[model samples]
Target chain A: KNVVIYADGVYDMLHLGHMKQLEQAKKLFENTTLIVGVTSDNETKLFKGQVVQTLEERTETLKHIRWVDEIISPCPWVVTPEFLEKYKIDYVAHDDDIYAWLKRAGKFKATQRTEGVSTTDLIVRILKNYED
Target chain B: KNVVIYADGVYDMLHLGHMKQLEQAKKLFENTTLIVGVTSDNETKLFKGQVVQTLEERTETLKHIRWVDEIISPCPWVVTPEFLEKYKIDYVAHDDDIYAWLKRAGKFKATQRTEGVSTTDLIVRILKNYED
Candidate 1:
């Protein structure tokens, strides 16, 4: 049986940090299929301020990465059993906090997040150095 | 007017090397726009063997990178004066060999390529370590 790992995120402002996380996720198992679930623009707007890239744009970005095997467009904000079943996702790997339901169900696995780099950090830098 | 930098490539199996090149291109000038021109699938298939991603998929991937301001889908293999004029591109940045015509036109600017990582290298590793 193939081990399929799922990583979910908004993936705005694709940076080295995002790349690192995906690399780590792929390293978990040999020949593992790494699928990325990109959150919808609506869901991201609710928490993230003024998303730079649209959902379609974000999805396209993730599809380019070498570590990613498949991409799920407009992934749900919260992971449910049905979502996992539908995708045949064996494990959900993430660095940030997981949903309560996903944790309780033992579907969530914490992965190392790249430190000192994020979409928010990049945006802030861009804003601060806009004149530079 | 924004000084737009053009970087052309196959961009197959997007890797750290590709990211580093884009980062370097962005650092060349403050407030400069980095536009990437991804070669069409047909173009890549001619030079490269068995391209892993489609032209549309490659375009989507480049669109996600923070450093990339715009992506030209089906970018011609050889950069022409007309291409620059059409896109209003100020400079063409590339690490590898530039076309003879582009060099003669004095439009090509050589950027530093990240060593030790490339799409071809990654593919070779995958083939070698398929079981790992």
Candidate 2:
């Protein structure tokens, strides 16, 4: 049977960490279709604070990604079982911090989060390097 | 017959651009071995200026890259014919800016540079976001 994995994220300033996470998500099974769900601008602002890369920019960034097959933008933050069923998402590949909502329902795949670098971390480096 | 391609960079604060460059270099030929050459801390400082990620950190970062077959650290900034022969390098994939020397000798392969992001561009982003 063909497998379908759904990986959702804010995808802010897509970096090596995001790439690694998606790579692992796609390899979670054989014959997989990796559908990346990029969060909406509004949701990102409400939950994750400021948005450096807009939703369109974020979605476009994943266009050339190796493991990605398709993309769904403006995706809901708190994904429900109905949402999974609607999209036929077999497993959600993400960190436990945010995807435990999918865990109890047996639809979550835990990923070893890449540390030491992030959007804010990038910001921090920039701040340190170029102070006024 | 097999082909060997060499891709070198400071790899300071390795980002999406570096990854794309390596990916393309690996795909340039069939049965290719992509050996990445990372510049030394001293050379990076002398030429590129301000090495954020040390030589060890830069070399270690390429360990998990998908397209990299081997890594050569402390690589010379000005590569010579003898260097290629020593490493069995068939082509040098990089910009015309630095590799005109190789270009004149027909050992150069031009890469489609990824725009809108770089180490300094990244630093600029960091500074703009967090101001005192």
Highest TM-score against the true fold, candidate: 2
lDDT of 2 by residue, B6-122 (tens): 988887766566677888898998889989899998978887787766787678657656678889887888888899999999999885455777888888987766776665575
Candidate 2 local lDDT, residue B6: 93
- Every candidate's lDDT: 0.74, 0.79
| Model 2, span A28-86: residue lDDT tens | 98889899999998988888787766687678667656678889887888878898889
The residue-by-residue lDDT of candidate 1 on A1-132, one tens digit each, is 578999988887565578778888977887788889898888788876556566875676565566888888888888778989998888899985446667877767778766645534533454566645
Candidate 2 TM-score versus the reference:
0.74
lDDT of 1 by residue, B1-132 (tens): 567899988886565567778877876776788889888888788876556566875676566565887888888888778888998988889985446666787766778766645534533454566644
RMSD of each: 16.9, 4.0
Tell me the interface RMSD of every candidate, in Å.
15.1, 4.7
Best by lDDT: 2
TM-score of candidate 1 to 2 decimals = 0.49
- CAPRI rating of model 2: incorrect
